């Protein structure tokens, strides 16, 4: 009885293994198949067309993280703060109080006791104003001046998430800036293609991540070397060129995609990283958007970054949320799915 | 016995795999282009 | 014959309904692994203990959740894993497949069969972390489950439902009387009662592969495969299968022992488990304990371990007998794991070396082995029969001693002592020979009501044997009327009584002795 | 502000509040787990403040299909159990949840289980005993009112029987209720003692609290701290007699010390908590007599490796007023309950305390029952014969005597017809002054089977 | 695209490589040290992907000289060895760098190192013996063809002794192919096997791997993954019956120990790594037959302090088919192969497979020993003289069996002069039956010690003025 | 390559050197000795173990 239930064992190990050959060598035909099909832009647009079709009948979903909740709740006021300062101070004055803003905190940085002293939790904010006073009462303007005792009043979970509150509200002030010039989507752009070359150019990105040496020789390099080009917008380099400056034990295109995104999140936008196998039509481009934005309700600013592997559909990614419509995606199931 | 058996077996379910193997090597168009036509999301001939 | 209908026929059903639609998923990226670790950031709303799908179809699961990443164990082929890599997650918590179909079967700790026979056709599944039965789903542990070991069935016997500890050094025969209580389980099944019928796990914790397999030639043999299945964590399996095959084992057992049916599991062995949990806990940077391990090893166990339970005849009345194993080391019990285990379980079978090395096998140390539910696991005729065992033996073993001085002993204590001896060349048995419960009764009739008194120490377990096989062979009624009554009845006792003398006749000692009266 | 939880390793759960809305020490926090299958609600003990406005938190549950951020709210107070008489004859778990009937007890008084010892001033200064009625434990190993009796028995000694008489003797003599502890519980053996209780009619006086063996170590270690306060409150506010029974403590000690571990803290000597003595001083200074009133407690405790200076024994025994050994050999010897009276031991068998008398009998009986066993040896394997005659009569004394301290048991009733008896202190004491002045060796020794005082050996003398 | 080296600690180096360069785990990347006294090129093992870009390596060669900055270079694959027949007769490092003729093998088929074990339905239980001409090891522990042996014990009991010991006795005569892999092992040992396996005209069918104590870990860790490549290769491939000798595997672990805490792992009980039991059990279970295909492997494995509870030899018990334990208190006694036959088990020492005589045998044998070994305290306080007869005849008996146990071995003239002995298996259980039934009791117990078979027991007897 | 353990308790009753003959050993043997050594002592370590 077992030699008989071994025969039938064998003979259905061999089945399974002919039919796995034939499914792998169908999915591979089905693989050359469907890759001589796309290479028709009306077959990527079909397939583009029909992913759209299918997300518009998704149903809608609902649902800095490093920052704790000291530091957190500071940074909250200290942009409340700038708000109110800059609606008042309007571009000019803008423009200035984000170079002293970092200009201070790059001091800041420079100088650690005064961080430390400027950084440590405490009861009262009278010391450490006056102290402000004591520093740079007059050397900046007075915008500058509320913007900093604001920020130093408040109490942070650690030193570093003061350099960074000012930082941050100097990003703020340009991309106010950039916004009364009403030139925003044009900044987005730019600070995203300088993400994405400076990802392309890894090694780019790590001279200039080396903080180690001095700031004007790598905002210089960065001048004449990238985003020094007749086709660049001004406020986009001049945030660039702030952020590298600034920049300490920071991966430098992460840190123009974090400009990037906190730049469309300033008008309330979620940021949509979505990768097409072509480049898009203006009209599927807003019904993409419309879409996406029906999804996750917030209005959604669509990035694409073409590709060939994806051969079609859209691999939207969102919030650390992906729609994978591609049609290599598709192929890696259809093999894998095999028995 | 069960060892002259299995070898026996063996040997002409080898014989008869690779024989099926050789039979089944025409509809591998049809499932492909059934399998292209399900992904795609549109019936191709091809 | 391979026909060419099934061949096109399963592809051509794959691909005809290959609906492979779109749909939201949460990512995470790997920022670090090692050593069959992953952390992954990202991933907001996964759950501790998800599992999660890497790339390449590896599969890990989350233990550690911080503000950073997740601390998830890779389950295998972890060298896959690499920085930067998208994760994503399942939605579900451990569980595996399980229904009537894993009988016969050797799987891994996810279920999926490793024997090569094909696939396993799941009646549902099952979380592995799904609550024991509370302490008001279940009724006192009153049905024997009989190893066919005569230590065990009349010194600490196992009622359904218990958790009886098998615990010793190594190479004391631990293995071996787990596999005898799987095989003594084959009549049980022929039977074809539910309501006797014992479905057999053989959990297999980081056993070498040939290991497992010479465990399943074992049960093929005996014909146990038909209601035994075999998860296997082989020695070569990462630690997460390691340490999730008892979890694995007992959602199977589980699964049957919740419709009315009577499992028993074996653990081989919870100490390898352990020490799975513990280089798991150890490489998740978790704070180390007593012999490094974690501060819920006990948990470990002792969850494990409750979920073996006799349910009320609410809930169908099935139970699940569990088998732990424990190796000691230095046959030191005082260790941490086998400390926790003896607490955890109802009752210990102690295997030792030196019994083992002086012919006493099963090695199981009596004066030391405990059954907590006792009489309520024994029949009434083995209950009867058994009951001046611990006794006579505790009181061998002190008289032990004075074994070359019988000129001085008194009458009794040199009886006493010649009954002992007798009693301990009874308890011995070989290897891959379970008694039924009847055989083992009338055995222990043998032993205890002084029919060994007339027989050499030397002839008597040929002679026990022998008796056996004469009475089977020709006074079966009396193995008739103990199993389906359960007692020894008076006329049975004599007609016994009477065959034992018969044999004595014509029984032929080694030195030629007679054996008569 | 309700926290959200942030880290999540096994129990262990560190939980996020606003600024001003951390909860204190020891609090007990809900979060939600929403997975069907292991959907639940935990209840979260606050261990640390970790700072930052993060608190570290002892899972009471599993926290399989935890979430991180999920919402967690604060109970405002520690983990509280219901109390009053109606939470006799219902079992409970360390939360107070009742297990035998869910939502019962909801609505009673709350007690947080947290709560300090009796004053230094409140302290009844003076040592009494607790005259339970059984001939043994009142003259060899008198039980200390509001004392600690370690209990110490294998499988198969009367230990459950012994737990279901000093049940029945309280609430009968003393008017008095039971809590039982079952710390590190096994289910199988809850349920069987569930089931027992019921028989014997003896849970309605009885109320049972089981942390089990397969929970996290928070609620095996906080099961103990629950029963106490269910006693407390009979104690201080019903004004009753409380007797108390742990079984094990040493689990109690060792899910410490697993908590401990998962916290971080560094173990101390042999592994253990570094606050083992802590711990158990909180635990034990509570079971005191005050205002009158007392919580005695008989406790079963586990001693490592048969090595009594271990760390957890050695705490453990710094609190024990009395210990009683349940032999083998005695339940064998059908003598009920089987208190092995040579290795149980009272300290309170003093002069000062129980009087001249009491201390001279049962120092007798000691001696010629420690004498009656150094002759055991040499009767066995020498026979009988083979000893003098002043040896016979000493061993037909012990062996008379020995049975007598045998007792027909309350408990008992079930097993066998004969009711129990209580025996008065007095009685027991002149019965054996006389079995040890020899007043009785003409008796056979089947008169001395479970009977109560001088009268009851009497009329089954004349039974003979 | 290549690495640079950021952090240099001992046997370890992080590596940090640009963004989608990372290497996988296990792959081989190559430093330069360009110091002159110590110039090479440092082969280092990616060990941990620790996140931005870093990964930390291994160095299997010393790291004396190595300089942060300097260039590493992916080799895109994991250490890979040469295999194939030519790989016979020559000894290879742990890389594959063939030492006794330099540059050879390097042309032939390179396998990696690191493989997954045979699948579970390949495995089928052995149980045939293995003659070996050893009287204890062929009585108490027979050996299983195709099976897994161990020789456990102590330092200095007589491992290597009895490795090389089953290499004159196994391998000289075996038909298919031969691997040693030295694993942390003296060098000495290493040129003084190469020779003595020229000389015994066995080389040309085996291969060497050599890993000597004085390498770095990495080099003791991949040693013998590298052997044990070489010996897949024969199985699978070649399709011929392998002998693998692997001495002494306990280095392997020793090895990732000395590694772990500076990889940043946690330590485990008694300081080992807390992937102890892992990676053991991967190596181990790399190491067997297959159905059809067999690989007799015969494993030293050092037990620390002579402590058979510590966690390395503990752990390894579980793979063996048969062990040899030695102990210390045998070799003090002068008994020769140390072996204690209390102690040392065999999956195939029972009646279905060595047949009933055998096991019979055998079991009376431990039976007197184990009461011996009970006797010997009594004996040692209050004297022989108070024991029952039948005690002092078992004493006499046991003494005689435990002499007759020891065995003057081919490999230990050495140590002795005295040429060595081979004794067929029907005679050993011959002539331990006669001595479980006290013929020889008449004999001098000297008489029993370090010979051969039955004749010369009655020879040493005759030259001792007994019959 | 081997060891000469030296023990007080030898030591002290005389033994100079204190060498353990049962558990000392030397891993090369014969090889490092003369011939006529070789034959005189060429089974002296296992005399006394024994
Ligand atoms: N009752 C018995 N009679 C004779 N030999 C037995 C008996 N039980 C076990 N053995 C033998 O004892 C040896 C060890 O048995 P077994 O493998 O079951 O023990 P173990 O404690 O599980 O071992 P390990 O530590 O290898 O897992 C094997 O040779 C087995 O055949
Ligand atoms: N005084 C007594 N009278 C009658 N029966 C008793 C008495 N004491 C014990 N027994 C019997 O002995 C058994 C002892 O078991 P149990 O009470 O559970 O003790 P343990 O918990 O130590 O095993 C009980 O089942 C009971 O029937
Ligand atoms: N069979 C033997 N006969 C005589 N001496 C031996 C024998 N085996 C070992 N020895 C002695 O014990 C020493 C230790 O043996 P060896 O195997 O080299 O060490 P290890 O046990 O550490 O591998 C040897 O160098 C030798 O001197
Ligand atoms: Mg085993
Ligand atoms: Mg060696």
Not at chain 3, 58 to 84: M, R, T, Y
Not at chain 4, 8 to 18: A, M
Request: charged share 25%.
């Amino acid at each position: 009885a077992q030699g008989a239930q071994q025969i039938q064992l064998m003979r259905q190990q061999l089945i399974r293994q002919l039919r796995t050959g034939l499914g792998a060598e169908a999915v591979n035909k089905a693989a050359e198949i469907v890759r001589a099909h796309v290479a028709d832009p009306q077959a990527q647009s079909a397939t583009v067309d029909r992913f759209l079709s299918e997300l518009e009948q998704m149903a809608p979903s609902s649902v800095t993280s490093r920052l704790r909740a000291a530091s957190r709740q500071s940074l909250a006021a200290l942009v409340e703060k700038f708000d109110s300062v800059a609606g008042g101070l309007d571009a000019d004055g803008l423009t200035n109080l984000a170079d002293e803003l970092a200009s201070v905190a790059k001091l800041l940085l420079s100088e650690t006791a005064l961080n430390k002293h400027l950084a440590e939790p405490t009861d009262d904010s009278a010391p450490k104003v006056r102290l402000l006073e004591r520093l740079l009462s007059d050397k900046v303007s007075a915008t500058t001046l509320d913007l900093l005792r604001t920020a130093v009043s408040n109490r942070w979970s650690t030193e570093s998430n003061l350099i960074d509150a000012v930082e941050h509200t100097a990003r703020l002030a340009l991309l106010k800036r950039a916004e009364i010039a009403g030139e925003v989507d044009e900044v987005e752009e730019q600070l995203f293609r300088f993400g994405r070359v400076l990802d392309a150019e890894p090694r780019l990105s790590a001279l200039l991540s080396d903080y180690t040496t001095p700031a004007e020789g790598r905002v210089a390099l960065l001048d004449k070397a990238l985003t020094g080009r007749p086709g660049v917008n001004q406020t986009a380099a001049a945030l660039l060129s702030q952020t590298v400056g600034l920049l300490r034990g920071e991966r430098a295109d992460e840190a123009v995609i974090d400009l990037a995104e906190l730049a469309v999140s300033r008008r309330g936008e979620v940021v949509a990283h979505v990768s097409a196998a072509a480049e898009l039509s203006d009209a599927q481009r807003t019904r993409l958007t419309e879409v996406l934005s029906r999804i996750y309700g917030r209005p959604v600013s669509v990035q694409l970054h073409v590709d060939p592997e994806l051969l079609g559909g859209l691999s939207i990614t969102v919030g650390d949320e992906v729609i994978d419509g591609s049609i290599a995606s598709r192929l890696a199931a259809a093999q894998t799915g095999l028995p | 016995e069960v060892a002259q058996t299995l070898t026996q077996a063996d040997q002409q379910l080898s014989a008869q795999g690779d024989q099926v193997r050789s039979g089944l090597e025409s509809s591998v168009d049809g499932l492909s282009a059934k399998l292209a036509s399900r992904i795609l999301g549109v019936d191709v001939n091809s | 014959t391979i026909s060419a209908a099934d061949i096109e026929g399963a592809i051509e059903d794959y691909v005809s309904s290959f609906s492979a639609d779109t749909e939201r998923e949460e990512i995470g990226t790997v920022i670090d692994a090692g050593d069959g670790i992953a952390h992954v950031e990202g991933l907001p709303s996964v759950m501790t203990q998800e599992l999660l799908e890497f790339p390449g179809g590896v599969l890990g699961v989350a233990l550690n959740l911080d503000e950073h990443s997740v601390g998830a164990v890779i389950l295998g082929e972890f060298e896959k894993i690499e920085e930067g890599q998208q994760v994503k997650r399942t939605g579900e918590v451990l569980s595996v497949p399980v229904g009537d179909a894993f009988l016969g079967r050797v799987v891994n700790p996810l279920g999926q069969p490793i024997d090569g026979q094909g696939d396993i056709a799941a009646e549902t599944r099952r979380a592995l972390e799904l609550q024991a039965p509370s302490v008001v789903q279940r009724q006192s542990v009153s049905e024997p489950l009989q190893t066919g070991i005569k230590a065990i069935d009349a010194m600490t016997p196992i009622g359904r439902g218990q958790r009886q500890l098998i615990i010793g050094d190594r190479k004391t025969g631990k293995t071996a009387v787990c596999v005898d209580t799987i095989l003594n389980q084959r009549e049980a099944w022929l039977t074809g009662d539910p309501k006797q019928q014992v479905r057999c796990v053989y959990v297999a914790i980081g056993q070498k592969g040939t290991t497992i397999a010479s465990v399943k030639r074992a049960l093929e043999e005996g014909g146990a495969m038909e209601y035994t299945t075999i998860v296997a964590a082989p020695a070569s399996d990462a630690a997460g299968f390691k340490w999730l095959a008892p979890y694995t084992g007992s959602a199977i057992g589980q699964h049957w022992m919740y419709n009315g049916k009577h499992v028993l599991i074996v653990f081989d062995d919870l100490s390898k488990q352990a020490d799975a949990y513990r280089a798991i806990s150890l490489l998740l940077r978790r704070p180390p304990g007593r012999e490094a391990f974690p501060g819920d090893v006990f948990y470990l166990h002792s969850r494990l371990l409750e979920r073996c339970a006799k349910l009320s005849d609410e809930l169908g009345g099935g139970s699940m007998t569990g088998l732990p194993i424990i190796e000691t080391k230095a046959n030191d019990i005082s260790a941490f794991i086998p400390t926790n285990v003896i607490s955890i379980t109802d009752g210990q079978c102690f295997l030792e070396s030196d019994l083992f090395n002086q012919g006493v096998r099963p090695a199981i140390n009596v004066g030391v082995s405990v059954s907590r539910v006792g009489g309520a696991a024994q029949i009434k005729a083995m209950k009867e029969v058994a009951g001046s065992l611990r006794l006579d033996l505790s009181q061998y073993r002190e008289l032990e001693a004075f074994a070359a001085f019988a000129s001085d002993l008194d009458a009794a204590s040199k009886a006493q002592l010649d009954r002992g001896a007798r009693l301990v060349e009874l308890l011995k048995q070989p290897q891959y020979s379970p008694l039924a419960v009847e055989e083992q009764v009338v055995a222990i009739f043998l032993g205890t009501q002084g029919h060994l008194d007339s027989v050499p120490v030397e002839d008597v377990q040929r002679f026990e044997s022998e008796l056996l096989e004469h009475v089977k062979a020709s006074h079966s009624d009396i193995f008739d009327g103990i199993r389906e009554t359960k007692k020894l009845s008076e006329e049975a006792e004599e007609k016994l009584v009477s065959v034992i003398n018969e044999f004595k006749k014509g029984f032929q000692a080694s030195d030629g002795s007679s054996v008569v009266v | 502000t309700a926290g959200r939880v942030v880290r999540i390793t096994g129990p262990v759960v560190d939980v996020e509040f606003p600024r001003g809305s951390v909860p204190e020490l020891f609090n007990a926090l809900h979060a939600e787990i929403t997975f069907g299958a292991l959907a639940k609600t935990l209840t979260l003990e606050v261990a640390q403040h970790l700072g930052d406005s993060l608190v570290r938190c002892i899972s009471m549950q599993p926290t399989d299909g935890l979430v991180r951020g999920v919402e967690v709210t604060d109970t405002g107070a520690s983990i509280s159990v219901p109390v009053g008489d109606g939470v006799k004859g219902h079992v409970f778990n360390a939360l107070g949840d009742c297990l035998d009937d869910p939502g019962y007890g909801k609505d009673f008084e709350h007690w947080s289980i947290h709560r300090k010892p009796p004053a230094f001033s409140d302290l009844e200064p003076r040592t009494e005993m607790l005259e339970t009625g059984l001939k043994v434990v009142d003259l060899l190993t008198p039980y200390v009112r509001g004392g600690k009796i370690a209990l110490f028995g294998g499988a198969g000694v009367g230990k459950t029987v012994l737990i279901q008489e000093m049940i029945n003797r309280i609430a009968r003599n003393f008017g008095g209720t039971s809590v039982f502890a079952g710390v590190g519980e096994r289910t199988r053996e809850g349920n069987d003692l569930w089931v027992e209780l019921a028989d014997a009619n003896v849970l309605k006086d009885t109320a049972l609290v089981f942390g089990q063996m397969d929970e996290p170590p928070g609620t095996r270690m906080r099961v103990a701290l629950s029963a106490l306060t269910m006693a407390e409150f009979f104690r201080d506010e019903q004004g009753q007699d409380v007797l108390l029974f742990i079984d094990n403590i040493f689990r109690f000690t060792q899910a410490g010390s697993e908590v401990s571990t998962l916290l971080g803290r560094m173990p101390s000597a042999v592994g253990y908590q570094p606050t083992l003595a802590d711990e158990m001083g909180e635990l034990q200074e509570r079971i005191t007599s005050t205002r009158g009133r007392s919580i005695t407690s008989m406790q079963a405790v586990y001693v490592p490796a048969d090595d009594y200076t271990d760390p957890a024994p050695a705490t453990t025994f710094a609190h024990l007023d009395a210990t009683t050994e349940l032999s083998r050999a005695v339940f064998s010897k059908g003598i009920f309950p089987a208190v092995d009276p040579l290795a149980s031991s009272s300290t309170i068998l003093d002069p000062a305390i129980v009087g001249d008398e009491h201390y001279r009998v049962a120092q007798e009986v000691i001696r010629i029952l420690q004498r009656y066993k150094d002759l055991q040896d040499i009767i066995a394997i020498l026979g009988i014969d083979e000893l003098s005659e002043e040896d016979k009569q000493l061993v037909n004394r012990a062996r008379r005597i020995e049975r007598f301290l045998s007792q027909n048991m309350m408990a008992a009733e079930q097993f066998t017809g004969q009711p129990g008896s209580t025996v008065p202190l007095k009685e027991t004491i002149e019965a054996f002054d006389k079995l040890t002045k020899g007043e009785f060796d003409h008796l056979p020794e089947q008169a001395f089977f479970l009977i109560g005082g001088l009268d009851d050996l009497a009329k089954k003398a004349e039974s003979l």
